[PDB]
Design a protein around this ligand. Structure first.
Ligand SMILES: C=C1/C(=C\C=C2/CCC[C@]3(C)[C@@H]([C@H](C)CCCC(C)(C)O)CC[C@@H]23)C[C@@H](O)[C@H](OCCC)[C@@H]1O
Length: 253
């Protein structure tokens, strides 16, 4: 019902988050030529044995994810209040939310035209098949694609998008957090900002949108769990560590 205006502090938070995102997410994907090249081995049958023996797309996707994790760390450090947390809690939040933020931010390159993540040209277009060539199964990829479409259909403003990622990162319910109270205070400030933005930018479905956005955070926890399970299996493959990166190994190890 009530549609209060954004306070000066809330306007600053949003401006800060938009700027942080613009500085950490390159919409031209110009750094992709620096990643190990993608390699697509003939695997129309989706052979688990073949995929594991080759892991042809893993070096490229691992570099992409590693690169993205570095960008997410940068984005997080710019979130108002994040610096107020102990170094220990910052690392805990980053490691636990990393894959979720990547899934969220990837929605920008995701396109419903052909259900793929398109980053410039055809060499950097990723479909279900490309992800299976990295060692993952449909048990993760299919729900991920469904998640991307659902997120796409929310038609989030960039403001809502960056606030959602910030809220995802600053979650007090991450195992291992020490000062959950402080984290919750920061998250509440971000959540209140999002709720307020939605209300004065969306007429009362403002309430339906916020609820739908919060539901996405829950969906991400499940995707996070499945990814962790699959990463474990992948780690068992001999010589897999060389196809990953030090950052990836530590974050998901
Ligand atoms: C990374 C990013 C992108 C796409 C994300 C994808 C497409 C291919 C497979 C991935 C990467 C999924 C798999 C399941 C994770 C695999 C990780 C592993 C191998 C460690 O287990 C998670 C998200 C999926 C591209 C661009 O929008 C951003 O890119 C930055 C450019 C601005 C974003 O930051």
């Amino acid at each position: 019902s009530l549609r209060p205006k954004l306070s000066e502090e809330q306007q600053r938070i949003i401006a800060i988050l938009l700027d942080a995102h613009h500085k950490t997410y390159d919409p031209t994907y110009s750094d992709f030529c620096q990643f190990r090249p993608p390699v697509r081995v003939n695997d129309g049958g989706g052979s688990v044995t073949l995929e594991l023996s080759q892991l042809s797309m893993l070096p490229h996707l691992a570099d992409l994810v590693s690169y993205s994790i570095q960008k997410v760390i940068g984005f997080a450090k710019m979130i108002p209040g994040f610096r107020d947390l102990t170094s220990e809690d910052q690392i805990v939040l980053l490691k636990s939310s990393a894959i979720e933020v990547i899934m969220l931010r990837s929605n920008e390159s995701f396109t419903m035209d052909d259900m793929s993540w398109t980053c410039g040209n055809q060499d950097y277009k990723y479909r279900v098949s490309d992800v299976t060539k990295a060692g993952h199964s449909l048990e993760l990829i299919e729900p991920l694609i469904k998640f991307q479409v659902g997120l796409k259909k929310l038609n989030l403003h960039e403001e809502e998008h960056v606030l959602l990622m910030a809220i995802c990162i600053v979650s007090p319910d991450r195992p291992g957090v020490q000062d959950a109270a402080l984290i919750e205070a920061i998250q509440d400030r971000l959540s209140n900002t999002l709720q307020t933005y939605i209300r004065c930018r969306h007429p009362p479905g403002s309430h339906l949108l916020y609820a739908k956005m919060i539901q996405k955070l829950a969906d991400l926890r499940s995707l996070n769990e499945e990814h962790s399970k699959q990463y474990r299996c992948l780690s068992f493959q001999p010589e897999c560590s060389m196809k990953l990166t030090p950052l990836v190994l530590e974050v998901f190890g």
